[PDB]
Assembly symmetry: D2
Homo-oligomer: 261 residues x 4
């Protein structure tokens, strides 16, 4: 089928990419970076994120693969020594696929932009103090005052969400998790503190109180949005599809990354 | 139908119980504390827990109701001023039901005991240091050294789980959450730190390394178990059924309990 | 003696300022905002901070006073209803003074700037990832990777330091406290996690590893510094002097601000 | 002078103890475990704690030494390969001493017991819920509801205090640090959350509200106290004296124990 390979760009990932292309040349495989069915990422999880956002409009037609040339990644979870075995099994097909949930972010102005996040989406203020009203399913839940907020996907829980005290969730759970950054809590100002885990169809809305400019990030992309009336979080109806070439359990990936080896 | 009412025992809950019984006497309702179909709890969440464990073997045949005579509870979430309205709508029937997931705990010795938890189940040592090997789906994940561990249901996340830094999960998510109590982390000893959220069919196993006696709690009940080979956590196949007499969203219950009013 | 009064600027603080000036006109008191011996702040703690930094070069010759027209402040800890009593006792003199420690921040480039902080000084990256080597008394302690770091004074511990999990320290302790913002900790990257409390004469040095541009804050002032070789923290030899007109213990100020009333 | 050596009891520490005794036999040194001036601990920090509590009534007349036969300890911070060099320099004398602060715990009943802690002192309930009123310098600060409380010395901050989120304090600071264990915080119940650092002469008092039986620990010793009216914490007037045979900075000891090597 049609495939493409993206590379981190260093000497090591480029040479592995050229070898896989040559290995694919021995099969009924066509290189196409416009309408690929297999997207192979060689480098790290950041390389995988760029590959994901590069083709975030053909997600239902693409199975992703990650190869880590550095340390183990949660998306780039296959070693370079398995590149030849990957070429063989991807060419035969007959492989199984696994799907992870995604986060949908909607930004409304006074004009509405939607984004797809594989890891998380964060909101901070542009200079001044960050104060937003948190609305859960049209119910005002809290007035947050602090550095910012982070809404994470299940597979994104091991990234920025973990550094903010959030829980690690198995990516088979269709949910999103909201965590706080340095919240102010006193007699006057009150936040829940705890991370919040939301199922599908639950809508979390952030609404400004004074300043209406925010620095909004979606995975690696961070942009200053001006004159926004609402930031809207929801579990996406779209999923990212991975090609499953053997068993590498998520909890083992968590152990190998944070505990040992 | 058949019903029963449990009371916290104070003058206030007993008098409300007698008034509801008399109110039920005006309908085709029979008081039966042996095979009830409606279990009404009057008092607090602790009163509701005892009602749950009192009938934990007829869960598929019982719809529970909680009335709080003190502060708002997450299970006793109806005010005493609505007792007359509750009697009317429970007698007519035609009410909808909602179901929350439960936690199954299995204790094995050298002889195996199973327990059902509505909030959480905790493990600590009996005197000496608490060290266990944490096994996730037959994969050794970590060697935990600390005060203990807590596995919580979704509706139990607002209880002891919250005090340990765990996330608040919407009870429509079929999952369990493991949190740590005062873990030792240094160059030699390593724990994940973060709370872990597990879906259905995932089995978390605790296995002793030296001392084989542990103080195991299930909701309010705490017992010393001796000569245990394994503690086994899993999302239960059973659910607790609530009678739904109006809309009181979980996130609103969280706001009313921790934020304001 | 010579005095001056700074105001938050709202109608309420300005009118209280004019009344105290008129009240001071009934005593041997001279208004002088160039070489004052008494600096009275009317507004909030932010108003007090600006008054402090306005006269941070005559600290050994000034006794500060804070009056809060809004909620209770840790520096503006006197109510407006006591303004007349403050005028009387400040004019007589004979009042006792109390001193709080300060934080000295030194920034070195490739050209060296020193700053005095009453609350805290923070360091973050300008866009890219924030990675610094933490050096304690010329000993390399850790390579920090995360959002940033915060070094707080004792009286500053109740401000941003508290939101980052730092401890509240009694301001009679001559020390500084370093806290982390969203640190990355895995098998490869290691931070201490815990807040660190340093005595006098201890020097904490932050040294860049790649990017040499950082957003450095000192209390309310936040500036982008380019081409910095070292950020250097130390407990200042200077102290801020408060005029003590009655007993308002720090721990009571903490209780009134975070617990109740 | 007079000396004694305590051993962890394993084959390795006993043989090192016999070799140091024989090495001391080549000098004007007398073994005396009743009135020693030098107390050498061989094993771990737990071995050092027992040596400290064994002679906690001759603290002003004893210089302590710790040798770790296992991993590095914060009190047993000298390797076995330096035992011969330690014998030489302890026999000559002329060594410098360093002193660490200690924690004084007073327990009052309806009859008053005082204890000296090198690491920390903790309070928990005996079975039932743990609720105490926290009184700081005769001012009611908070009503604590949770698992328990921990008051730590500066050198004890790297032990249980660290596992509870407390800050690491340099042991030259004469202070104590109070940390919370799993506190309940909601609309009804309020705790400060943050760790609290107290200077000398500050008295922290714990007073019961209902149950008057508590499990009180002092370092390794844990005892059930019944019918207690007050638990009283204060920085001790006594200090523990270490013999200083070279420079091993506390922050380096922290790095070697938690960061690397
Ligand atoms: C650059 C950088 C730091 C984050 C790396 N990273 C990414 C891009 N995704 C993940 C993930 N799912 N889990 C852990 N780590 C991750
Ligand atoms: C007694 C006592 C303290 C816990 C009260 N409590 C119970 C029994 N369940 C819950 C719950 N689901 N959420 C919050 N709080 C709860
Ligand atoms: C604006 C704003 C938020 C911080 C207010 N604030 C200041 C300026 N100092 C302190 C302080 N020492 N303790 C608590 N809060 C403080
Ligand atoms: C047994 C056991 C666990 C604690 C060991 N330990 C002791 C006895 N003191 C300390 C200390 N000052 N810093 C770190 N760790 C310590």
């Amino acid at each position: 089928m049609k495939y493409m390979i993206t590379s981190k760009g260093d000497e090591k990932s480029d040479l592995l990419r050229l070898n896989m292309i040559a290995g694919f040349g021995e099969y009924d495989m066509e290189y196409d970076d416009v309408e690929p069915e297999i997207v192979i990422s060689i480098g790290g999880d950041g390389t995988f994120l760029s590959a994901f956002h590069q083709y975030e409009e053909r997600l239902d037609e693409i199975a992703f693969i990650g190869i880590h040339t550095g340390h183990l990644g949660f998306y780039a979870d296959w070693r370079p020594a398995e590149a030849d075995k990957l070429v063989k099994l991807l060419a035969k097909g007959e492989y199984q696929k696994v799907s992870y949930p995604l986060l949908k972010t909607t930004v409304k102005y006074g004009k509405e932009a939607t984004y797809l996040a594989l890891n998380e989406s964060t909101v901070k203020s542009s200079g001044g103090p960050f104060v937003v009203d948190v609305v859960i399913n049209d119910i005002h839940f809290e007035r947050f005052r602090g550095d910012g907020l982070c809404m994470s996907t299940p597979s994104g829980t091991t990234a920025y969400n973990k550094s903010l005290g959030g829980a690690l969730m198995h990516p088979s759970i269709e949910a999103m998790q909201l965590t706080e950054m340095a919240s102010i809590n006193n007699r006057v100002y009150r936040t829940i503190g705890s991370p919040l885990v939301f199922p599908k169809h639950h809508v979390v809305s952030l609404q400004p109180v004074n300043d209406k400019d925010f620095q909004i990030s979606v995975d690696h992309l961070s942009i200053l949005h001006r004159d926004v009336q609402e930031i809207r979080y929801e579990v996406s109806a779209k999923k990212i599809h991975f090609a499953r070439f053997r068993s590498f359990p998520f909890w083992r990936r968590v152990h190998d990354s944070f505990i040992e080896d």
